């Protein structure tokens, strides 16, 4: 009876790995919090937030299709989340709601944890969806000199443009958006890049048999390559990077660090990352 | 995949409901989790918004929201309408049903000892949540007469009106006597099968008293029930036991009340003997 509730507001909720990860981390540390998932869409989201406040829930993770909508229900968003226009985390600080995007802080935390310094580097970002804008937003916020966002001409292209505009106009980070079709612009981008980051669905099943990088000669050792895809754990892009001497960061790195960021936001304590890693079976 | 079952009250710190329900849930491996939420009259309406939006299976309700909660359910039981307060809400696809298991619980605890409430005469001490719950249910289930005594406080008037609702909707006879009429108390008692305390007397910081100043108001063979369960053995029960007469304690009510809630939420049978032992109610 002394535990606070932390939710997950989304629909569907069947395939989430947050519940087990947060709860196992919580048990390990013996903290007075319980994590539960709830089926919430755009129509019930407003009443769910009223519940969050009335019941004094500690917070809630947020997923499709409520991430953009949730931005309208918090009192405060971080500068990175305002760039993104979407949050996956809400923290209830005694009635005052703070909105965060731990996908961006997590991925950026995973990078730093490897001993890589973000400040002033050049990132070649593939995609402009939820993972990519969150990643680039935080990256800009933490000092990236430039971001060479490459996105095909699909339903996300204009999104890339506004994102670049927002990041450009609100940060000292220089973002350019280039059409993926221009392979030479891509070749020059990669050569000048310190980090290659895939935030697209390419690499994830069923498309598990492809990368946005046609030839490994396009990559150069010394380049750090990060992957958002965690299914499969070993993407084609990752294998290219490992077959080119590049240092790497897999999907599990972002997933675990992202979970950590949420955990600390809600508990104030450090996340037992190695433990959660083994317990969830992300080690093999 | 688990559904939430809450408790909406303030305070919540002392409630034994969370442990009982979660022990019972865990014993059967049921896909539900019970959790207490600190909620009062001002946050109750938003908390109900939350029960619907989050799709909770339901929620237990305790002070100070039992009366207010009746205005937030789509449907209430006949007993609940007589009491004017509920301790239980069940959410059936957005449709909310209110029940007062405190009534059914106490009555079930009585029937369970081997005693039949039909046609009997109960001397009912009190007019709060416990007493009106018990009286409502007891009346509905064939109680011939309810003689309730209450001091001249804020619950006296509530007692009068309560009596009226019951007297008007049941075949039960209910009277309201000033607890200060020591004579009527001994007399209206004299002819009684059941003595039931629903007041706070017996519970700390009133653990040294009883509303029974004499045993000659007790015919050892009589039935004395106590709502108080802190302490387990109240002075009113300690007298009764030494008096020789048979009694039903607060634990009986607590467990049967909890059982009803559990079955309403889960559809399963409550593991009462297990919870009893685990809770150390033995
Ligand atoms: N590791 C983690 O913690 C984590 C967290 C979030 C998302 N992800 C993963 O990251 C990936 C992206 O998810 P999201 O939510 O941002 O997706 P999203 O639907 O919001 O956007 C997908 C992006 O991929 C690009 N894309 C898709 N197919 C493409 C193709 N064939 N060629 C070129 N571009 C293509 C789109 O233009 C778009 O910019 C998914 O694999 C998801 O599983 C991982
Ligand atoms: N065992 C269970 O399941 C269960 C359930 C509910 C309540 N309870 C217990 O029942 C008792 C009553 O709780 P409630 O919710 O009905 O309280 P309540 O506030 O609603 O009503 C209190 C009643 O006690 C009377 N009273 C208070 N002090 C008195 C005094 N000094 N002398 C005479 N009468 C006095 C009042 O007039 C009133 O009628 C408490 O001990 C509570 O813990 C037990």
UniProtKB/Swiss-Prot annotation, chain B:
Q: Extract one GO BP annotation from the record.
A: shikimate metabolic process
**Induction section of the entry:** Induced under carbon limitation but not under phosphate limitation.
* Keywords in alphabetical order: Amino-acid biosynthesis, Aromatic amino acid biosynthesis, NAD, NADP, Oxidoreductase
Q: Under which EC number(s) is this enzyme classified?
A: 1.1.1.282
Annotated residues that bind NAD(+) are located at 127-130, 150-153, 200, 227-230, 250
Any one GO MF annotation of this record: shikimate 3-dehydrogenase (NADP+) activity
Provide the reaction this enzyme catalyses: L-quinate + NAD(+) = 3-dehydroquinate + NADH + H(+); L-quinate + NADP(+) = 3-dehydroquinate + NADPH + H(+); shikimate + NADP(+) = 3-dehydroshikimate + NADPH + H(+); shikimate + NAD(+) = 3-dehydroshikimate + NADH + H(+)
Q: What does the entry list as the binding residues for substrate? A: 66, 102
What CDD domains does its record include? NAD_bind_Shikimate_DH
Query: EC top class, in one word?
Result: oxidoreductase
Q: Its annotated pathway?
A: Metabolic intermediate biosynthesis; chorismate biosynthesis; chorismate from D-erythrose 4-phosphate and phosphoenolpyruvate: step 4/7
**Record note on what altering residue 17 to A does:** Kinetically unchanged as compared with the wild-type
Pfam families named in the record? SDH_C, Shikimate_dh_N
Q: What does this protein do?
A: The actual biological function of YdiB remains unclear, nor is it known whether 3-dehydroshikimate or quinate represents the natural substrate. Catalyzes the reversible NAD-dependent reduction of both 3-dehydroshikimate (DHSA) and 3-dehydroquinate to yield shikimate (SA) and quinate, respectively. It can use both NAD or NADP for catalysis, however it has higher catalytic efficiency with NAD.
On subunit structure and binding partners, the annotation says: Homodimer.
Q: Which family does it belong to?
A: Belongs to the shikimate dehydrogenase family.
The entry's protein name is Quinate/shikimate dehydrogenase
Per the UniProt record, the source organism is: Escherichia coli (strain K12)
Q: What is the lineage of its organism?
A: Bacteria, Pseudomonadati, Pseudomonadota, Gammaproteobacteria, Enterobacterales
**Gene symbol of the encoding locus:** ydiB
